């Protein structure tokens, strides 16, 4: 079959710069069977490029596609504010399956900003219900790549946390991430130290926000 690879995962440019997105085809398909799509949250995918290099009507001219048959490129000549989204390439005919690529997120360039790290102990109202949720907040950071590590009495937690990230703020171009560590009331009362270890490009050393039960 065909395996699609897109690089980079995140492409970070300023509004007005040129964008070049790579889509790699493992076995390499006919140039008529490579399409590009733009996806904004809440809206259906939007066909930007079909047949490697063609544009459907109503697609601005700044969007341009090219490809050799096994390597494909989507070019945005001048990045407009509405162009910051996720872009997928798709095997449109050489399937089946008509596989979509993993996707490339085009976000707004910015100087590196370290996250403001906050930790929130669980409330007594929630503790009385039998569940304990410990929230760690990474506030206003850039770039998007952030590593959150929960430590309960210096024990690395793994599969009992969930991350949620806001969309890139339109004003300062920063992200905000929440990490919630959920435990039962019994396990929570057994341990004392609860820490949140953050790894980000803006921090020289990993910042630890901790408290004792």
């Amino acid at each position: 079959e065909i395996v699609l690879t897109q690089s980079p995962g995140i492409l970070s440019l300023a509004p007005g710069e040129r964008a070049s997105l790579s889509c790699r085809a493992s076995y390499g398909l006919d140039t008529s069977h490579l399409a590009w799509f733009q996806h904004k949250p809440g809206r259906p995918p939007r066909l930007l490029i079909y047949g490697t290099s063609s544009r459907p009507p109503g697609v601005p001219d700044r969007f341009r596609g090219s490809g050799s048959g096994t390597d494909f490129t989507l070019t945005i000549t001048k990045l407009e504010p509405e162009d910051f989204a996720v872009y997928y390439c798709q095997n449109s005919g050489g399937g089946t399956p008509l596989i979509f690529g993993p996707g490339t997120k085009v976000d707004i360039k910015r100087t590196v900003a370290a996250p403001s790290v906050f930790i929130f102990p669980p409330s007594d109202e929630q503790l009385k219900s039998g569940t304990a949720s410990v929230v760690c907040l990474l506030n206003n950071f850039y770039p998007r790549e952030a590593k959150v590590q929960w430590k309960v009495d210096n024990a690395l937690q793994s599969g009992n946390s969930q991350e949620s990230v806001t969309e890139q703020d339109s004003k300062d171009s920063t992200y905000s991430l929440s990490s919630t560590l959920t435990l039962s009331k019994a396990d929570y009362e057994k341990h004392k130290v609860y820490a949140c270890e953050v790894t980000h490009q803006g921090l020289s050393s990993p910042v630890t926000k901790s408290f004792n039960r």
Binding site: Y50, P56, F100, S116, I119, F120, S123, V135
Partner: protein, 230 residues
Amino acid sequence: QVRLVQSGGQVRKPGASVTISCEADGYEFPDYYIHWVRLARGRGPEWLGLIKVGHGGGAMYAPSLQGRISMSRDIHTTTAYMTLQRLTHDDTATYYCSRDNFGTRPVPGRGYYYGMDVWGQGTAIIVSSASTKGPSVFPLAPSSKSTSGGTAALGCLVKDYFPEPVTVSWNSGALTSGVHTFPAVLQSSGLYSLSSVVTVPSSSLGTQTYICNVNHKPSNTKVDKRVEPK
């Protein structure tokens, strides 16, 4: 005006099945195949299958769904259909239908082109065992572990509700600067949960009242949570 209209959102139990319709309008329905694609939370689009609406109505499905998914088309009513059985937690996504020339016709100016150019508005399929449940709002209290150089962070934990969505405001809408309401994550329990936080000056923690207002239209639940320093 080329358009595709899908049926409304549905909530199904695990093991049940769902059928979504896709009504065409504004174009010649026989001239285009119809694909079905879904998008789950935090995941790229997944191609489910296509219907050869103009060449016998046969369908080709994705390998990971063959045996579970079924598609067909009626030309006189200009409707395409999709049925997915044995619904699991992973099947929770927004399901789309789209038209495509699929190289069948050399349309003028474009040739034997391939491309899903027109899409339906999408159908939200929520696979869960939970019933309509209101949220329980817990405070994210600000303190020493929540202050850092003049600014302080506080918020609300909106946990254990179903289904989506909840709307969160602060101080009845008078507080927006510094607010970050996070997308809800479907917990393993089948109930959604999210947090809404806001950064305020640390000096205002002793003079200003901060109340998050949670509304859950499905359960008709409205909660105002006053968040105090801990």
